[PDB]
Structure formats: C-alpha cells, structure tokens
A paper describes a structure:
deletion at positions 169 to 171. deletion, indicating that the motor is locked in the CW state. to the one introduced by the in-frame PAA deletion. is different from that of Tm-FliGMC. is also different in these two structures. here, we propose a new model for arrangement of [name] subunits in the motor. interaction between helix E and FliGM of the neighbor. the orientation of the neighboring FliGM domain. orientation of FliGCC to cause anomalous switching behavior. change in the interaction between FliGCC and MotA.
[name] forms a ring on the cytoplasmic face of the MS ring. directly involved in the switching of the flagellar motor. generation and in stator assembly around the rotor.
Author numbering: 105 to 169, 173 to 186, 195 to 325
Write the structure that this text describes.
C-alpha cells in the first residue's frame, strides 16, 4: 500500500494541527505522497509562512543538492515529489494563495518558478493560445488522440480547435468520432496529457505564443 494512505482516513484540522509544527521538509514529504487536491487543501490551510517554502521543497524534493541527487541515483541503481506534483498542487490551490506562492518564487527562484508555471498547463489552457499556435500544435496530433482528448473538452474548446484544423483533418476527425463510441476515461486523460506534452515541448522550442 501507499505511504500516508491513512490520510484520507484521518480527521480534517487535527491534520493541519500536527503538520504545522513539523519541519517544512517533512511537510513536503507527506504532501508529495497525497492526491494533489488533498495536498493543495492542506497546504492552503498551513500557516502563511510555511506555504512557499513547503511548495518549493515539494518541487525540489530529491533534487535539493548534488549530494541528494548522487544518493538517490545510487539507490535506484543498486536495490515522488518533483515539478509535476508541485504544479498539480498549485492548480488545485485557491487562486489567491497560488498567486502569492508564485510571486514569491518568481522573486527567489525565478527559474524553478518558470518550470512550475509551464508544468501547470492544463488542457483547457489551450483556450489561452492564439490561433496560429493552436494550428502549430494540431500538426503534431494524430486523429485518434485528438478525438479522445475532445471527449473531455468544453464545447468552446472543441470549437476553437475545430475552426483551426485543415478541412481534411477535420473530416478525418469527424469520421473517427462517428465510429468511435464510448471510451475509458483514462484514455481521454492520456490523450490530453499527450497533447499537453506536445505544447510543453513546442514552447521549450520557444515557438508557442499565449
């Protein structure tokens, strides 16, 4: 079973009560093991002074120093946490708290802040992109992944994507949808994740405009 799994079984406040007086690092460890919405809920309820530091430690969980990297590597060779975890927690925080943590990271860890922000991109964020960028992305997506990803998108996002496809691609997509049928929710999920990865890569290449 997974560590800290008894957390959803534990009380609400007594939970924040104990974590409050623990070392930030110890806090980072416990939260990085929980479902993000749960972690975001706890994080936002922690004393303001711990929020940023704890979020940063979650982001750099086993990357804190060259020594830590060297040690962790050796373990895996012989016998959790990270940027994604942090970004997922930030997406589930209330806007206000999220903004405060991001503003501080921008000031003290500008790079890490940038890694987290870019990792925070969700499928609906595609609505933030301009039409040209969207077309750029579409050329990198196969018909089936697109169809799957769309079964989990808002009608508005559906539209903005459609009006940006080539006539031939749109026809192929429509065909897929017609003979696709019901699908496992997790397929819709990885399809969207796949498109998101394409976006994350196209911006690392500095060719994606918001």
């Amino acid at each position: 079973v997974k560590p800290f799994s008894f957390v959803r079984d534990t009380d609400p406040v007594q939970l924040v009560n104990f974590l409050q007086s623990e070392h930030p690092q110890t806090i980072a460890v416990v939260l990085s093991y929980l479902d993000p919405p749960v972690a975001a809920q706890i994080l936002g309820a922690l004393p303001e002074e711990l929020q940023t530091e704890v979020l940063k430690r979650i982001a750099l969980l086993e990357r804190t120093s060259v020594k830590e990297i060297e040690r962790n590597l050796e373990k895996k060779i012989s016998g959790v946490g990270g940027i994604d975890t942090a970004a997922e927690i930030m997406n589930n925080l209330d806007r206000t708290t999220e903004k405060k943590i991001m503003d501080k990271l921008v000031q003290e860890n500008p790079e890490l802040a940038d890694e987290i922000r870019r990792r925070m991109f969700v499928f609906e964020d595609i609505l933030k992109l301009d039409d040209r960028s969207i077309q750029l992305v579409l050329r990198e997506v196969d018909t089936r992944d697109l169809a799957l990803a769309l079964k989990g998108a808002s009608d508005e996002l559906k539209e903005k994507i459609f009006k940006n496809m080539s006539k031939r691609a749109a026809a192929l997509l429509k065909d897929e949808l017609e003979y696709m049928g019901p699908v496992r929710l997790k397929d819709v999920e990885e399809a969207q994740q796949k498109i998101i990865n394409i976006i994350r890569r196209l911006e690392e290449a500095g060719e994606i405009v918001i």
